[PDB]
Short mmCIF file of C-alpha atoms in Angstrom, two decimals:
data_model
loop_
_atom_site.label_atom_id
_atom_site.label_comp_id
_atom_site.label_asym_id
_atom_site.label_seq_id
_atom_site.Cartn_x
_atom_site.Cartn_y
_atom_site.Cartn_z
CA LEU A 2 53.72 -79.57 -71.46
CA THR A 3 56.50 -77.23 -70.33
CA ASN A 4 56.02 -73.49 -69.76
CA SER A 5 57.23 -70.72 -67.42
CA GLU A 6 56.36 -69.78 -63.77
CA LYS A 7 57.23 -66.16 -62.69
CA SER A 8 60.10 -65.75 -65.24
CA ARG A 9 59.75 -66.14 -69.00
CA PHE A 10 63.25 -67.67 -69.24
CA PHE A 11 62.62 -70.72 -67.01
CA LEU A 12 60.44 -73.77 -67.53
CA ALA A 13 57.91 -75.53 -65.30
CA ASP A 14 55.58 -78.51 -65.78
CA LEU A 15 51.89 -78.46 -66.72
CA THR A 16 50.47 -81.66 -65.24
CA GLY A 17 46.89 -81.13 -66.38
CA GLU A 18 43.53 -79.58 -65.58
CA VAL A 19 40.86 -80.45 -63.01
CA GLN A 20 37.29 -79.35 -63.70
CA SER A 21 34.31 -78.97 -61.38
CA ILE A 22 30.82 -79.21 -62.89
CA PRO A 23 27.67 -78.01 -61.07
CA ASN A 24 25.25 -80.60 -59.74
CA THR A 25 22.18 -81.38 -61.85
CA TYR A 26 19.09 -83.10 -60.42
CA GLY A 27 16.57 -84.88 -62.62
CA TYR A 28 14.58 -87.22 -60.38
CA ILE A 29 11.13 -85.70 -60.91
CA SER A 30 11.66 -85.32 -64.66
CA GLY A 31 12.75 -88.96 -64.90
CA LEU A 32 9.82 -90.15 -62.80
CA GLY A 33 7.62 -89.90 -65.89
CA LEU A 34 4.67 -88.48 -63.96
CA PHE A 35 3.85 -85.62 -66.35
CA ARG A 36 2.65 -86.86 -69.73
CA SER A 37 3.38 -84.58 -72.68
CA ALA A 38 0.38 -82.72 -74.10
CA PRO A 39 1.55 -80.86 -77.22
CA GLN A 40 -0.63 -77.90 -78.12
CA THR A 41 -1.41 -75.59 -81.03
CA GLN A 42 -2.78 -72.65 -79.00
CA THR A 43 -1.36 -70.31 -76.37
CA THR A 44 -4.09 -71.17 -73.83
CA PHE A 45 -6.46 -74.01 -72.99
CA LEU A 46 -9.75 -74.41 -71.15
CA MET A 47 -11.29 -77.09 -68.95
CA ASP A 48 -14.72 -77.97 -67.59
CA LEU A 49 -15.18 -78.71 -63.90
CA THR A 50 -18.52 -80.53 -63.33
CA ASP A 51 -19.51 -81.45 -59.73
CA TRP A 52 -22.71 -83.51 -59.12
CA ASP A 53 -21.34 -83.55 -55.55
CA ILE A 54 -24.82 -83.95 -54.08
CA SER A 55 -25.70 -87.20 -52.36
CA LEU A 56 -27.85 -86.53 -49.27
CA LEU A 57 -29.79 -89.12 -47.26
CA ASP A 58 -33.57 -89.56 -47.76
CA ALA A 59 -35.66 -88.12 -44.95
CA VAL A 60 -38.79 -90.17 -44.32
CA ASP A 61 -42.27 -88.92 -45.19
CA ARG A 62 -45.82 -89.90 -44.29
CA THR A 63 -47.51 -92.21 -46.79
CA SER A 64 -50.64 -90.03 -46.81
CA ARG A 65 -48.89 -86.63 -47.00
CA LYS A 66 -47.00 -87.62 -50.19
CA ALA A 67 -43.96 -85.34 -49.96
CA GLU A 68 -40.61 -85.85 -51.69
CA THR A 69 -37.18 -84.32 -52.38
CA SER A 70 -34.90 -83.48 -55.34
CA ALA A 71 -31.33 -82.20 -56.10
CA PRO A 72 -29.77 -79.87 -58.77
CA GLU A 73 -26.34 -80.05 -60.38
CA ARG A 74 -23.45 -77.70 -61.25
CA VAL A 75 -20.96 -77.15 -64.16
CA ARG A 76 -18.09 -74.60 -64.32
CA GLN A 77 -15.20 -73.74 -66.67
CA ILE A 78 -11.63 -72.46 -66.26
CA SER A 79 -8.65 -71.34 -68.37
CA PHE A 80 -4.85 -71.61 -68.34
CA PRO A 81 -1.81 -69.52 -69.37
CA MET A 82 1.70 -70.85 -70.10
CA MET A 83 5.30 -69.78 -69.48
CA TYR A 84 7.84 -68.75 -72.12
CA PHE A 85 11.65 -68.95 -71.92
CA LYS A 86 14.10 -67.28 -74.30
CA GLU A 87 17.66 -68.36 -73.50
CA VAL A 88 19.99 -66.69 -76.02
CA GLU A 89 23.76 -66.64 -76.49
CA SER A 90 26.23 -65.56 -79.18
CA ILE A 91 29.66 -66.67 -80.40
CA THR A 92 32.30 -64.23 -81.66
CA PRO A 93 35.84 -64.86 -82.96
CA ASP A 94 37.28 -62.81 -80.08
CA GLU A 95 36.95 -65.92 -77.88
CA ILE A 96 39.16 -68.02 -80.19
CA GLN A 97 41.82 -65.49 -81.25
CA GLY A 98 44.83 -66.20 -79.05
CA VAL A 99 42.98 -68.02 -76.25
CA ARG A 100 44.81 -71.19 -75.26
CA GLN A 101 42.95 -74.34 -74.30
CA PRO A 102 43.02 -74.92 -70.53
CA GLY A 103 44.98 -77.98 -69.50
CA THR A 104 47.46 -77.72 -72.39
CA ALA A 105 50.64 -75.72 -72.84
CA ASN A 106 50.58 -74.06 -76.27
CA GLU A 107 47.39 -75.17 -78.04
CA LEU A 108 44.70 -72.63 -78.88
CA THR A 109 40.99 -73.17 -78.37
CA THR A 110 38.80 -73.93 -81.37
CA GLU A 111 35.35 -72.78 -82.43
CA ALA A 112 33.89 -76.30 -82.34
CA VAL A 113 34.62 -76.92 -78.66
CA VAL A 114 33.31 -73.48 -77.66
CA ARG A 115 30.09 -74.06 -79.60
CA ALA A 116 29.66 -77.55 -78.14
CA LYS A 117 30.16 -76.40 -74.56
CA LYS A 118 27.83 -73.42 -75.03
CA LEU A 119 25.11 -75.64 -76.50
CA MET A 120 25.47 -78.22 -73.72
CA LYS A 121 25.28 -75.46 -71.11
CA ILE A 122 22.14 -74.09 -72.78
CA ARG A 123 20.43 -77.50 -72.80
CA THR A 124 21.26 -78.33 -69.18
CA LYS A 125 20.26 -74.83 -68.04
CA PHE A 126 17.00 -75.34 -69.92
CA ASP A 127 16.10 -78.74 -68.47
CA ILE A 128 17.00 -77.92 -64.86
CA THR A 129 14.25 -75.29 -64.97
CA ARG A 130 11.91 -77.94 -66.37
CA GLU A 131 12.69 -80.10 -63.34
CA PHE A 132 12.14 -77.10 -61.06
CA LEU A 133 8.77 -76.35 -62.67
CA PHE A 134 7.78 -80.00 -62.34
CA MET A 135 8.53 -79.86 -58.61
CA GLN A 136 6.62 -76.57 -58.32
CA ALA A 137 3.59 -78.14 -60.00
CA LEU A 138 3.86 -81.09 -57.63
CA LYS A 139 3.75 -78.56 -54.79
CA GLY A 140 0.46 -77.24 -56.20
CA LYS A 141 1.49 -73.68 -57.14
CA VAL A 142 3.37 -73.13 -60.42
CA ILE A 143 5.59 -70.20 -59.40
CA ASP A 144 8.38 -68.79 -61.57
CA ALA A 145 11.96 -68.74 -60.33
CA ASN A 146 11.42 -64.96 -60.02
CA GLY A 147 8.42 -65.48 -57.74
CA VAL A 148 5.81 -64.74 -60.42
CA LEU A 149 2.60 -66.70 -59.90
CA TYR A 150 1.40 -68.36 -63.10
CA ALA A 151 -1.08 -71.04 -61.99
CA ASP A 152 -2.61 -71.19 -58.50
CA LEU A 153 -4.17 -74.65 -58.74
CA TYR A 154 -5.84 -74.60 -55.32
CA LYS A 155 -7.70 -71.40 -56.27
CA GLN A 156 -8.35 -72.24 -59.96
CA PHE A 157 -9.89 -75.41 -58.59
CA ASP A 158 -11.61 -74.30 -55.35
CA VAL A 159 -9.91 -76.75 -52.98
CA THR A 160 -7.70 -76.54 -49.90
CA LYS A 161 -4.22 -77.92 -49.33
CA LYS A 162 -3.83 -80.46 -46.53
CA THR A 163 -0.76 -80.22 -44.29
CA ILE A 164 0.01 -83.17 -42.01
CA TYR A 165 2.12 -82.50 -38.91
CA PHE A 166 3.98 -85.72 -38.17
CA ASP A 167 5.67 -84.47 -34.95
CA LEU A 168 8.79 -86.63 -35.20
CA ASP A 169 10.58 -84.95 -32.28
CA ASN A 170 7.98 -86.12 -29.75
CA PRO A 171 8.31 -89.83 -28.84
CA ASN A 172 4.67 -89.91 -27.71
CA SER A 173 3.36 -89.10 -31.20
CA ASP A 174 1.81 -91.96 -33.17
CA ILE A 175 3.38 -92.20 -36.62
CA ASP A 176 0.82 -94.85 -37.59
CA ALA A 177 -2.06 -92.41 -37.08
CA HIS A 178 -0.42 -89.71 -39.20
CA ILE A 179 0.42 -92.16 -41.99
CA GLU A 180 -3.15 -93.48 -41.92
CA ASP A 181 -4.51 -89.92 -42.04
CA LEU A 182 -2.34 -89.18 -45.08
CA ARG A 183 -3.46 -92.42 -46.74
CA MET A 184 -7.17 -91.82 -46.04
CA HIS A 185 -7.19 -88.17 -47.15
CA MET A 186 -6.16 -89.24 -50.65
CA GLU A 187 -8.90 -91.91 -50.64
CA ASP A 188 -11.85 -89.77 -49.53
CA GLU A 189 -10.86 -86.60 -51.43
CA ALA A 190 -10.00 -87.98 -54.88
CA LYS A 191 -13.68 -87.77 -55.89
CA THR A 192 -13.37 -89.73 -59.13
CA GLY A 193 -16.36 -92.05 -58.78
CA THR A 194 -14.08 -95.10 -58.66
CA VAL A 195 -12.34 -96.90 -55.80
CA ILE A 196 -9.02 -95.53 -54.53
CA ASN A 197 -6.14 -97.60 -53.16
CA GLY A 198 -4.59 -94.74 -51.19
CA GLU A 199 -1.25 -96.54 -50.77
CA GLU A 200 0.18 -96.04 -54.28
CA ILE A 201 1.25 -92.53 -53.30
CA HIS A 202 4.69 -91.01 -53.70
CA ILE A 203 6.27 -89.54 -50.58
CA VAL A 204 9.31 -87.32 -51.14
CA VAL A 205 11.09 -85.87 -48.10
CA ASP A 206 14.35 -84.10 -47.23
CA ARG A 207 17.25 -84.87 -44.88
CA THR A 208 15.59 -83.61 -41.71
CA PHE A 209 12.28 -85.43 -42.17
CA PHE A 210 13.95 -88.69 -43.19
CA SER A 211 16.46 -88.68 -40.33
CA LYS A 212 13.85 -87.78 -37.72
CA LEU A 213 11.48 -90.44 -39.09
CA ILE A 214 14.00 -93.28 -39.06
CA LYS A 215 15.29 -92.10 -35.66
CA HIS A 216 11.85 -92.22 -34.02
CA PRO A 217 11.63 -94.87 -31.27
CA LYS A 218 8.42 -96.42 -32.61
CA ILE A 219 9.82 -96.80 -36.14
CA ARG A 220 13.13 -98.19 -34.88
CA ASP A 221 11.41 -100.59 -32.46
CA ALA A 222 9.05 -101.90 -35.13
CA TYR A 223 12.09 -103.18 -37.06
CA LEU A 224 14.56 -103.97 -34.27
CA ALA A 225 12.57 -107.01 -33.09
CA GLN A 226 11.90 -108.33 -36.61
CA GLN A 227 13.80 -111.17 -38.30
CA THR A 228 12.82 -110.28 -41.87
CA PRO A 229 15.75 -109.45 -44.18
CA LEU A 230 14.02 -106.12 -44.80
CA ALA A 231 14.31 -105.28 -41.10
CA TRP A 232 17.99 -106.27 -41.14
CA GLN A 233 18.64 -104.08 -44.18
CA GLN A 234 16.73 -101.10 -42.80
CA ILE A 235 18.21 -101.17 -39.28
CA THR A 236 21.82 -102.14 -40.08
CA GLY A 237 22.15 -102.08 -43.87
CA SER A 238 22.76 -99.22 -46.28
CA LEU A 239 19.14 -97.95 -46.57
CA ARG A 240 20.23 -96.45 -49.92
CA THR A 241 18.17 -99.00 -51.79
CA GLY A 242 17.80 -97.70 -55.34
CA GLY A 243 17.20 -94.81 -57.69
CA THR A 244 19.29 -91.99 -59.09
CA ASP A 245 18.55 -88.29 -58.63
CA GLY A 246 21.41 -87.34 -60.96
CA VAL A 247 24.06 -86.58 -58.33
CA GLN A 248 24.05 -89.73 -56.18
CA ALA A 249 24.16 -93.31 -57.41
CA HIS A 250 21.42 -94.55 -55.08
CA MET A 251 18.52 -92.68 -53.51
CA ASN A 252 17.76 -93.69 -49.93
CA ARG A 253 14.28 -95.09 -49.33
CA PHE A 254 12.35 -96.36 -46.32
CA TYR A 255 9.47 -98.84 -46.04
CA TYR A 256 6.96 -98.60 -43.18
CA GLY A 257 3.93 -100.27 -44.76
CA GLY A 258 2.33 -99.57 -48.11
CA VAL A 259 4.15 -96.23 -48.34
CA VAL A 260 7.78 -95.62 -49.31
CA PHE A 261 9.64 -92.58 -47.96
CA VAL A 262 12.20 -91.28 -50.47
CA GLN A 263 14.77 -88.66 -49.49
CA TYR A 264 15.21 -86.14 -52.31
CA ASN A 265 17.69 -83.27 -51.90
CA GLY A 266 17.64 -81.12 -55.04
CA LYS A 267 19.01 -77.59 -55.04
CA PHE A 268 18.90 -74.95 -57.78
CA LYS A 269 19.95 -71.31 -57.91
CA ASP A 270 18.35 -68.33 -59.61
CA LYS A 271 20.27 -65.44 -61.24
CA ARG A 272 20.07 -63.44 -57.97
CA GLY A 273 21.87 -66.11 -55.96
CA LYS A 274 18.99 -67.46 -53.89
CA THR A 275 18.95 -71.25 -53.54
CA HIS A 276 15.70 -72.95 -54.56
CA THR A 277 15.62 -76.22 -52.66
CA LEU A 278 13.21 -78.53 -54.46
CA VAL A 279 11.66 -80.20 -51.39
CA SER A 280 10.54 -77.18 -49.38
CA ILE A 281 7.42 -75.38 -48.19
CA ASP A 282 7.27 -71.65 -48.92
CA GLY A 283 7.15 -70.16 -45.42
CA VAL A 284 8.88 -72.75 -43.22
CA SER A 285 12.50 -71.51 -43.47
CA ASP A 286 13.39 -72.71 -39.96
CA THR A 287 15.82 -75.62 -40.09
CA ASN A 288 15.48 -78.65 -37.83
CA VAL A 289 11.97 -79.03 -39.30
CA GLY A 290 11.38 -81.69 -41.94
CA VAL A 291 9.34 -80.95 -45.05
CA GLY A 292 7.95 -83.48 -47.50
CA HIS A 293 5.43 -83.73 -50.31
CA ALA A 294 3.01 -86.58 -51.01
CA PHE A 295 1.27 -87.11 -54.34
CA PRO A 296 -0.22 -90.06 -56.27
CA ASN A 297 1.58 -92.10 -58.90
CA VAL A 298 0.33 -93.18 -62.32
CA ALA A 299 -1.21 -96.31 -60.77
CA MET A 300 -3.63 -94.67 -58.31
CA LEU A 301 -6.35 -93.46 -60.67
CA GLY A 302 -5.13 -95.35 -63.76
CA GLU A 303 -3.99 -94.30 -67.25
CA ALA A 304 -7.45 -92.71 -67.61
CA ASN A 305 -7.12 -89.89 -65.08
CA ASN A 306 -3.52 -88.59 -65.36
CA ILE A 307 -3.72 -85.59 -62.97
CA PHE A 308 -0.13 -84.70 -64.03
CA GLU A 309 0.64 -83.44 -67.53
CA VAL A 310 2.67 -80.68 -69.18
CA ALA A 311 1.47 -78.72 -72.22
CA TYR A 312 3.85 -77.37 -74.86
CA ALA A 313 3.02 -74.59 -77.31
CA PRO A 314 4.73 -73.30 -80.47
CA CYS A 315 7.03 -70.32 -81.03
CA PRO A 316 6.39 -66.77 -82.34
CA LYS A 317 8.41 -67.56 -85.49
CA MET A 318 7.15 -67.89 -89.09
CA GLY A 319 6.26 -71.50 -89.89
CA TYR A 320 5.33 -72.21 -86.32
CA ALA A 321 1.76 -70.86 -86.16
CA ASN A 322 -0.96 -73.23 -84.94
CA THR A 323 1.66 -75.98 -84.75
CA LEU A 324 2.02 -78.71 -82.14
CA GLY A 325 4.33 -77.56 -79.38
CA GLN A 326 7.78 -78.98 -78.76
CA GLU A 327 9.92 -79.25 -75.64
CA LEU A 328 12.75 -77.16 -77.09
CA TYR A 329 13.28 -75.02 -80.18
CA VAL A 330 16.87 -74.15 -81.10
CA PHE A 331 17.76 -71.73 -83.90
CA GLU A 332 21.09 -70.64 -85.39
CA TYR A 333 21.73 -67.29 -87.05
CA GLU A 334 24.84 -65.70 -88.55
CA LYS A 335 25.87 -62.15 -87.69
CA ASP A 336 26.22 -59.74 -90.61
CA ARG A 337 29.67 -59.16 -92.18
CA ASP A 338 30.93 -62.51 -90.80
CA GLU A 339 30.90 -61.17 -87.24
CA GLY A 340 29.94 -64.45 -85.56
CA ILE A 341 27.03 -66.78 -84.85
CA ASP A 342 23.85 -66.34 -82.80
CA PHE A 343 21.78 -68.91 -80.90
CA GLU A 344 18.27 -69.06 -79.46
CA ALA A 345 16.31 -71.48 -77.29
CA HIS A 346 12.55 -71.33 -76.74
CA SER A 347 9.97 -73.32 -74.79
CA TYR A 348 6.29 -72.46 -74.23
CA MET A 349 5.41 -74.84 -71.40
CA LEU A 350 3.43 -75.16 -68.18
CA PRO A 351 2.85 -78.16 -65.90
CA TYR A 352 -0.34 -78.53 -63.92
CA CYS A 353 -2.34 -80.93 -61.76
CA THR A 354 -6.06 -81.38 -62.37
CA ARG A 355 -6.82 -82.49 -58.77
CA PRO A 356 -4.60 -80.30 -56.57
CA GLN A 357 -6.36 -81.49 -53.40
CA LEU A 358 -4.38 -84.74 -53.63
CA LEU A 359 -1.03 -82.93 -53.36
CA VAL A 360 -0.41 -82.75 -49.60
CA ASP A 361 2.58 -81.62 -47.56
CA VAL A 362 4.01 -83.40 -44.51
CA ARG A 363 6.01 -81.68 -41.77
CA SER A 364 8.15 -83.00 -38.93
CA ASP A 365 6.94 -80.49 -36.32
CA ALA A 366 3.78 -80.36 -34.25
CA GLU A 367 0.59 -78.60 -35.36
CA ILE B 2 20.83 -102.11 -5.57
CA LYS B 3 22.25 -105.60 -5.06
CA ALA B 4 21.72 -108.27 -7.69
CA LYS B 5 18.63 -110.49 -7.63
CA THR B 6 17.37 -109.06 -4.34
CA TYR B 7 13.76 -108.59 -5.50
CA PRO B 8 11.86 -111.66 -6.73
CA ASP B 9 9.99 -109.74 -9.48
CA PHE B 10 9.82 -106.42 -11.30
CA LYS B 11 6.84 -105.14 -9.29
CA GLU B 12 8.76 -105.30 -6.02
CA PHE B 13 11.91 -104.08 -7.77
CA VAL B 14 10.38 -100.79 -8.95
CA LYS B 15 8.67 -100.29 -5.58
CA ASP B 16 12.05 -99.66 -3.91
CA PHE B 17 13.64 -98.15 -7.02
CA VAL B 18 11.33 -95.13 -6.71
CA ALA B 19 11.80 -95.08 -2.93
CA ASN B 20 15.58 -94.93 -3.40
CA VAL B 21 15.14 -92.07 -5.88
CA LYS B 22 12.92 -90.23 -3.39
CA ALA B 23 15.77 -90.63 -0.87
CA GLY B 24 18.22 -88.82 -3.17
CA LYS B 25 19.79 -91.85 -4.86
CA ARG B 26 20.17 -91.58 -8.64
CA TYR B 27 20.99 -94.29 -11.18
CA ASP B 28 22.27 -94.32 -14.78
CA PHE B 29 22.71 -97.53 -16.81
CA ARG B 30 21.94 -96.63 -20.43
CA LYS B 31 25.45 -97.64 -21.54
CA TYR B 32 25.48 -101.12 -19.96
CA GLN B 33 21.75 -101.79 -20.12
CA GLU B 34 21.95 -105.44 -21.18
CA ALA B 35 24.05 -106.31 -18.11
CA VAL B 36 21.52 -105.22 -15.47
CA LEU B 37 18.03 -106.14 -16.76
CA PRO B 38 16.98 -109.79 -16.47
CA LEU B 39 14.73 -111.13 -19.19
CA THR B 40 11.03 -111.60 -18.35
CA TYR B 41 9.38 -109.50 -15.63
CA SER B 42 8.94 -112.56 -13.38
CA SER B 43 12.67 -113.14 -12.98
CA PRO B 44 14.56 -111.86 -9.91
CA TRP B 45 15.59 -108.22 -10.29
CA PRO B 46 18.14 -106.88 -11.05
CA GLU B 47 20.34 -109.35 -12.96
CA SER B 48 23.49 -107.60 -11.71
CA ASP B 49 24.01 -104.96 -9.05
CA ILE B 50 23.08 -101.48 -10.31
CA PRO B 51 25.68 -98.95 -9.08
CA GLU B 52 24.81 -95.51 -7.79
CA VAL B 53 25.95 -92.35 -9.55
CA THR B 54 26.85 -88.90 -8.23
CA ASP B 55 26.82 -86.88 -11.48
CA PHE B 56 23.22 -87.41 -12.62
CA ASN B 57 22.61 -84.53 -15.03
CA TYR B 58 19.84 -85.66 -17.39
CA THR B 59 17.82 -83.13 -19.39
CA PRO B 60 15.60 -84.92 -21.95
CA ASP B 61 14.67 -83.39 -25.29
CA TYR B 62 10.92 -83.85 -24.73
CA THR B 63 8.40 -83.17 -21.98
CA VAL B 64 8.83 -86.20 -19.71
CA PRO B 65 5.50 -85.76 -17.84
CA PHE B 66 3.17 -86.31 -20.78
CA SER B 67 -0.01 -85.60 -18.83
CA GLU B 68 -0.22 -84.76 -15.14
CA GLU B 69 -0.88 -88.47 -14.46
CA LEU B 70 1.11 -90.32 -17.15
CA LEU B 71 4.82 -90.70 -17.85
CA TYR B 72 4.19 -91.57 -21.51
CA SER B 73 1.14 -91.72 -23.73
CA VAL B 74 -0.51 -95.12 -23.40
CA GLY B 75 1.22 -97.32 -25.98
CA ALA B 76 4.48 -95.35 -26.24
CA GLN B 77 7.58 -97.51 -26.74
CA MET B 78 10.97 -96.29 -25.52
CA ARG B 79 14.33 -97.78 -24.57
CA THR B 80 14.06 -99.52 -21.19
CA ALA B 81 17.02 -97.60 -19.76
CA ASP B 82 15.33 -94.40 -20.94
CA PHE B 83 12.19 -95.28 -18.98
CA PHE B 84 14.09 -95.28 -15.69
CA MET B 85 15.77 -91.96 -16.50
CA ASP B 86 12.46 -90.34 -17.45
CA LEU B 87 10.89 -91.80 -14.32
CA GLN B 88 13.77 -90.38 -12.26
CA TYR B 89 13.23 -87.01 -13.94
CA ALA B 90 9.60 -87.01 -12.79
CA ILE B 91 10.33 -87.76 -9.12
CA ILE B 92 13.03 -85.06 -9.08
CA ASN B 93 10.63 -82.41 -10.39
CA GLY B 94 7.95 -83.18 -7.81
CA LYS B 95 5.79 -85.91 -9.33
CA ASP B 96 4.94 -88.96 -7.23
CA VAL B 97 4.55 -92.45 -8.65
CA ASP B 98 1.34 -94.35 -7.87
CA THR B 99 1.42 -97.48 -10.07
CA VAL B 100 4.05 -98.59 -12.58
CA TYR B 101 2.33 -100.25 -15.54
CA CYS B 102 3.98 -103.66 -16.03
CA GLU B 103 1.12 -106.17 -15.77
CA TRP B 104 0.90 -107.44 -19.36
CA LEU B 105 4.30 -106.35 -20.70
CA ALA B 106 6.44 -108.96 -22.43
CA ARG B 107 9.84 -107.38 -23.17
CA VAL B 108 12.52 -105.88 -20.93
CA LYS B 109 15.50 -105.68 -23.34
CA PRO B 110 16.27 -102.78 -25.52
CA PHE B 111 12.74 -101.48 -26.10
CA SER B 112 9.88 -101.88 -23.63
CA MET B 113 6.42 -100.32 -23.29
CA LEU B 114 6.72 -99.28 -19.64
CA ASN B 115 4.49 -96.57 -18.15
CA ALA B 116 3.82 -94.99 -14.77
CA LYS B 117 0.79 -93.31 -13.23
CA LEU B 118 1.93 -90.06 -11.64
CA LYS B 119 0.63 -87.87 -8.82
CA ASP B 120 1.49 -84.54 -7.24
CA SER B 121 3.76 -84.02 -4.22
CA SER C 211 36.26 -98.85 -29.27
CA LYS C 212 33.70 -96.12 -28.59
CA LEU C 213 31.75 -96.85 -31.79
CA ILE C 214 31.51 -100.64 -31.53
CA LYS C 215 30.21 -100.48 -27.93
CA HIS C 216 27.84 -97.56 -28.50
CA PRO C 217 24.28 -98.50 -27.41
CA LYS C 218 22.75 -97.60 -30.81
CA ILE C 219 24.85 -100.18 -32.67
CA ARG C 220 25.33 -102.66 -29.80
CA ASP C 221 21.65 -103.53 -29.36
CA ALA C 222 20.96 -103.28 -33.10
CA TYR C 223 23.51 -106.02 -33.73
CA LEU C 224 22.46 -107.88 -30.58
CA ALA C 225 18.90 -108.33 -31.85
CA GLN C 226 20.41 -109.12 -35.26
CA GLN C 227 20.28 -112.80 -36.22
CA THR C 228 22.50 -112.93 -39.31
CA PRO C 229 25.81 -114.82 -39.63
CA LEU C 230 27.31 -111.45 -38.64
CA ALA C 231 27.02 -112.52 -34.97
CA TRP C 232 30.62 -111.24 -34.81
CA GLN C 233 29.43 -109.13 -31.81
CA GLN C 234 30.66 -112.04 -29.71
CA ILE C 235 33.33 -113.30 -32.18
CA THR C 236 36.49 -111.60 -33.52
CA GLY C 237 36.26 -108.06 -34.90
CA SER C 238 39.75 -108.62 -36.38
CA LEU C 239 37.72 -108.89 -39.63
CA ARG C 240 39.90 -111.84 -40.51
CA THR C 241 40.90 -109.02 -42.92
CA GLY C 242 43.64 -106.39 -42.81
CA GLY C 243 46.88 -108.24 -43.59
CA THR C 244 48.73 -104.99 -43.19
CA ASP C 245 49.82 -102.57 -40.46
CA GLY C 246 53.00 -104.71 -40.88
CA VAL C 247 52.63 -105.48 -37.14
CA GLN C 248 49.26 -107.32 -37.09
CA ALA C 249 48.35 -110.02 -39.61
CA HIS C 250 44.71 -108.94 -39.34
CA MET C 251 43.30 -105.48 -38.69
CA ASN C 252 40.13 -104.59 -36.81
CA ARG C 253 37.15 -103.97 -39.09
CA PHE C 254 33.52 -103.06 -38.44
CA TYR C 255 30.52 -103.15 -40.79
CA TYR C 256 27.60 -100.78 -40.21
CA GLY C 257 25.34 -98.53 -42.25
CA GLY C 258 26.68 -99.89 -45.53
CA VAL C 259 30.18 -98.55 -44.85
CA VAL C 260 33.12 -100.30 -43.19
CA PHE C 261 35.18 -98.80 -40.37
CA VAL C 262 38.86 -99.78 -40.24
CA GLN C 263 41.21 -99.35 -37.28
#
């Protein structure tokens, strides 16, 4: 560990190397909301029935002998999927004479280059999976390049509900907005069963969370309370539990049957634009909170699993009409011992069968 | 405003608004616990409330909620903030008819105080 | 001095009813054996972090 500075005939000291690694967020992927649905075909269909027809019975006259009736309805839809083809190559020109960073006179080896390239490929491939999961939770599966692949609200003939919490105004009633959010998910599920409406996930950003906990009603509801929960939420850390991959504990808030979780995930495309995970396409103004609410696995049961991701096979011999996999990795050797080639495929698309449940919450007035 | 001069809150706020109408301004959000006696039936104020000469208070929200209400019915705010928002209303031309304190139970940090406003 | 007496923390700890009623008692943390001039150094607990003077 002794080499030169600006003269080849003098020696200096090489203390070591310090590395910075980009942040990687995996909260939504680790939530386990989307159940894997491996597939053999490149597209799938679904039936959307809709009795949706209970009217009240208008009275008749016993002598006249009139009556009523009611028809039904049954429709069908289809679905495409997205394909990703990460590819990278290794040549000896990256090993010939290249010294390992952090050491004085040791050359790099093929094994470490291959390992780091493979690890980079895998992390680059799963961050986009997390991004697509968040996009599906938003209700519109949009590519990182802004290419629409599945407009759930259209494909399903529903409308997205946006709830304006109005956290800046002390006169606003947070209880009413929370109750509206809770009731919308109860009266719009339309499953034929009973809906709790309080098992919902609420994921917000810095602005929404700070404005919510700062609101005088929320603060007052806990200031005059002797429960240990009130003590922890007014004075304590408020970073209760969880791990989004960058921070050891996600910060959560309890104001009834609902839990507000602050999620701050950021990803970049190849053009440099930053894709913040918790955002609403359109509201770019700052000082406005944005959050997304969606059910968990416990709302409708293991039966109805609104959230699922379908995987499809590759266009490679041996993989025709085969159950899809999350990731396919292949290795090929260049001709005349010129190096090694790599590939990484995934034919995937997440979707939500009841997009009307996915609602957005905002911290500004209507 | 000398300490314990008014035997209740109702007669305290009657001459608090009158003092404000006369050009006197008050600010006690930093030492709030030292000037508000507990319970609205106790003599007001607990300690003498000093005057101020640099009252420059611009709130972040519309203080006159309606044309006849300082806050929406049921709004909870810091007690010291109520007096500032009330002072903001008299300065801008709103007159106070009745200050809602009949069934209130808390005076310390957060209280549900309201005022019925009028023009001129 | 400005932080401990700020109205947002002052009333929050005033309504607090935990053994941390050290809003009246000593903020010398009974901790901080250093500063080589003061056996105990001022210390404040809030928001999950600890402020040290």
